[PDB]
Design an enzyme around this catalytic site. Structure first.
Site, PDB file in Angstrom:
ATOM      1  CG  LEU A  24      -2.197  -0.881   1.224  1.00 58.92           C
ATOM      2  CD1 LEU A  24      -1.870  -2.352   1.450  1.00 58.92           C
ATOM      3  CD2 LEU A  24      -3.160  -0.398   2.295  1.00 58.92           C
ATOM      4  CG  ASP A 139       8.538   0.208 -15.549  1.00 57.31           C
ATOM      5  OD1 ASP A 139       8.122   0.118 -16.722  1.00 57.31           O
ATOM      6  OD2 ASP A 139       7.766   0.281 -14.571  1.00 57.31           O
TER       7      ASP A 139
END
Length: 263
Positions: A24, A139
């Protein structure tokens, strides 16, 4: 290297930003510094496969290892670590990400700010490639570029974040054994970032092919997004060289930074 540890008494919680790859995300604040932070937690997925929990832990650790050695204004900073549930305490970047900003077509980013964004990201990647050994993001795309400010006069406008979508990836990396990702693969992804800032468009969005054909076109036929005719010649050259099929033709970032500064 040096990565300080922080306890719950040192951190103030506020809201929940979202869900990440391994847990989270939370908005917070240091009570010591009073500065706002983003907190990434590790949560072990409830069954999720045995091997899925292992890679979740190893990805968390990989991100800790990479971020703890980087210290540059155009790269998101890791302030510290937490344990109860394992957590990364990183600086909060207040103006969202590049991907979402560019979607606002009614409010085009003005040219001077576009140049600041290009230079800021280039400076961050230059630093990465100057490390021993060179740091590879693996990425790089517009959702992973965080916006500090859109003021042309701000000390920092853009920051590189979320260290690791074939339209962002260098041809030699597509469907390849991961250790073929050299730093030159980031340089290709950067060309696509430059393209998206320039046009406000997604790279390769002008084309539609099935996945196998698409990859073959990129790899074997040198398919690239079309650089607009009104693009400044020095920018066009940087983009073109940065997305070369041959990785060794993709320039060193000292050259990239110099060229962009002359725009």
């Amino acid at each position: 290297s040096r990565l300080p540890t922080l306890a719950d008494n040192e951190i103030e919680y506020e809201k929940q930003i979202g869900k990440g790859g391994f847990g989270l995300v939370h908005k917070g604040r240091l009570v010591k510094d009073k500065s706002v932070v983003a907190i990434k937690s590790l949560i072990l997925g409830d069954s999720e496969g045995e091997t899925e929990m292992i890679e979740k832990f190893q990805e968390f650790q990989r991100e800790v290892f990479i971020m703890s050695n980087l210290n540059h204004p155009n790269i998101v900073k890791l302030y510290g670590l937490m344990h109860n549930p394992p957590r990364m305490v990183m600086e909060f970047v207040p103006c969202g990400d590049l991907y979402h900003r560019l979607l606002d077509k009614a409010h085009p980013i003005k040219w001077s700010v576009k140049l600041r964004l290009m230079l800021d990201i280039a400076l961050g990647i230059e630093y990465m490639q100057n490390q021993n050994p060179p740091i590879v993001h693996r990425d790089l795309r517009s959702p992973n570029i965080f916006l500090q400010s859109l003021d042309e006069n701000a000390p920092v406008c853009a920051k590189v974040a979320d260290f690791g979508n074939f339209q962002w990836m260098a041809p030699e990396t597509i469907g390849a054994e991961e250790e073929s990702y050299t730093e030159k693969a980031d340089t290709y992804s950067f060309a696509m970032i430059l393209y998206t800032i320039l046009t406000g468009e997604g790279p390769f969005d002008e084309y539609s092919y099935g996945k196998i054909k698409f990859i073959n076109m990129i790899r074997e036929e040198g398919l690239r997004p079309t650089i607009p005719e009104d693009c400044p010649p020095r920018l066009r050259n940087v983009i073109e060289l940065c997305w070369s099929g041959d990785p060794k033709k993709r320039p060193h970032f000292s050259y990239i930074v110099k060229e962009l500064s002359e725009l």
